[PDB]
A paper describes a structure:
In this work, we demonstrate these properties using a 9°N DNA polymerase. We show that 3′-esterified dNTP can be incorporated into a template-primer DNA by using MS analysis and X-ray crystallography to validate reaction intermediates and products. We further used structural analyses to examine the incorporation of 3′-NL into DNA.
Before protein crystallization, the incorporation reaction was performed at 4 °C for 16 h with annealed primer-template DNA, dNTP or 3′-NL, and 9°N-I in the presence of Ca2+ (see the Methods section). The DNA with incorporated dAMP is translocated back to the original state, and a divalent ion (Ca2+:1) is near the phosphodiester bond.
Author numbering: 1 to 757
The structure:
Amino acid sequence: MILDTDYITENGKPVIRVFKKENGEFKIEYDRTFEPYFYALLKDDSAIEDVKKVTAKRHGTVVKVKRAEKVQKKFLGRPIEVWKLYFNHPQDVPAIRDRIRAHPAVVDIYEYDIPFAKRYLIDKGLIPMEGDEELTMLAFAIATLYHEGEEFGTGPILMISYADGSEARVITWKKIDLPYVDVVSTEKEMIKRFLRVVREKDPDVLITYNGDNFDFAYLKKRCEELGIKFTLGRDGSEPKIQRMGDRFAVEVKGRIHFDLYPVIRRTINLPTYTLEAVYEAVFGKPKEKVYAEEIAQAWESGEGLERVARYSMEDAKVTYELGREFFPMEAQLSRLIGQSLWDVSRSSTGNLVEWFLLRKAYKRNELAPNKPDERELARRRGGYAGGYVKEPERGLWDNIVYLDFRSLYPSIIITHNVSPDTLNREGCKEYDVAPEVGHKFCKDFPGFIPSLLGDLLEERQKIKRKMKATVDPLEKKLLDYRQRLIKILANSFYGYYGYAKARWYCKECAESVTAWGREYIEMVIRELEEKFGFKVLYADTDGLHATIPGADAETVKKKAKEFLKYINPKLPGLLELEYEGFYVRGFFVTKKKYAVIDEEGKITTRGLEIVRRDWSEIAKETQARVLEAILKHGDVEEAVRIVKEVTEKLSKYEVPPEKLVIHEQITRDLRDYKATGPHVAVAKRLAARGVKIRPGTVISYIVLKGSGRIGDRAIPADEFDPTKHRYDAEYYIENQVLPAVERILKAFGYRKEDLRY
DNA sequence: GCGGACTGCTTACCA
DNA sequence: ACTGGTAAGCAGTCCGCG
DNA sequence: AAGC
Ligand SMILES: [Ca+2]
Ligand SMILES: [Ca+2]
């Protein structure tokens, strides 16, 4: 099982290190033979002698082309001849590449920004996280004395919690008498004690919650101020910080630093992402929250020190529990993309697709397009036409069928062979032509992406067969992750085609997919309404809600399945329409906003305030209780009694403040905001007080009684106090509750004023 | 000038 | 930070008005 | 080779 790769320099020459776990033991394999390289397209081959003589400087050392061999490759289908240029050190490439491109004889250069360690994984054909190797994991958390205003690192680390399968303990330097607490001389020895526990436990995986930004940064600054060599690595190295956009990332050599925060942020949609919120969402069990202001007063007084210690251990225990939960699916993602778990767990879809495609490109001798420069990036600014959204037939309807396509965009990319290397190919025998955009795609030979997509559909069939024919419940779950992750990778290719920063960016490809999508959904709707007996109530990109008005449940279902048996044969390749479910009643409010109830009484909510975090619980809860009244029962009169009851409760200040919190994200650097609404106003006040507001930060706030701009009375939910502050009853009635319930009751001819009081 | 309509900046949903 | 399509809140600006 |  390969964990990761990296390189070191021995007498100015690079040596690859492969970190693996074989037969229960950890091993480092060294490779001295691998050479860095990039490609150069020349005007004529005679010029190679001039290009070989091109030089540069790196740390006051003369850098030259080590040697050059002429190679035959494919570039977007067509065969191309380029010169592979080898160099002594990977650092030679960034030093010299600009000058080799500048040279008049050189048309272009390619594959010059591929990190050396990852180049090795791809070219040697190595896949990390192969086999079934039982990896040992240690979770850890820290507790700190904070004070409002101080620089990050001033406050000493009070406690270091850690957890595995066997135990969950706390290291501290205060007199706290508990079984799991370990008291020691000073902060210095506490940190040294933790370093000894990891040396003695020798974990393959370190698990933190937001350790990329908080935990490891704090330990680096405290180790500097105390003069400790923080050697957590298996080669004896210290943890290395790395930049990754708006955020940083901590690497620990030989171990896998598994930070759950980026994982959770990409995997679960929650109103907030506190360790307490994520625990409740994943496992269902509650978790107590001890604040810094409470924690500090408990450290100085020493009265509440025992309570803070329980919080410290619970963070470690829960973090390990979450670690164990997410690691296996992430280790499958590592296998599928063919990069380290460390990289894959911190990567967005763009980089995952790009890494997958780079690997496949090497296998198929495909030269990789360059990442766009500032000027090319500017040319990709323009958008293109998307999905078709039918204006719904608003109101309450009975006996509804939901019909949708299966993997519509992947179906299209495969069926119509949509690829940059098939776009406007010269002298193709056969073509598929995009309906409105009018792009010709060659059918003579399979396209790169289409072919990979074919591979993934068949690979998924194989996995689904293996799952039925396997007794072991563990291997069943592992194969279930693999096929679920394949399905996601497949549904990512459309978006990547339209992603300006993509190497294999193709607007014409993206445009053609959406255009075909619109042709098919609109054709299905037209057929369903003209030929068959159906009224199409609503239709989004790849799915429609239909009924036959003068008909009953058994009829609507029978006629629907008949329509599938009709249409599917008429749809080309793997374009299939499917019966997804029947609904007794459906309530269509606007585009993207509706609710349906099935035969079993389960209500499915789409797009309404109920699902959105930037609405208060009181509004969402009240909208849900008004939907239930109308969808499940028949009583519009019951809904009117609920809205009137909630408005009365708000007026008498009886609704608890937990139900008034509004959650809005900060999406950019605070300076980049042109408009300044409540969450931004609240965020700027926290920033002025010296709180770290990164993009991704969720602002939780409450509106206090007063007039004028909402932002002026917006306060962090944390700092609300019933004794001093009074929440804005009129705001929560007129701006939160009544608007949410009026979406629904608007259709039944209720005025907003009539629902009040 | 008033007070309500309109619009650009946001966000978080949908697919 | 994989795409476009969309409703809607907030806070400024615009615009009817008799 | 790191942080920035
Ligand atoms: Ca549905
Ligand atoms: Ca078919």
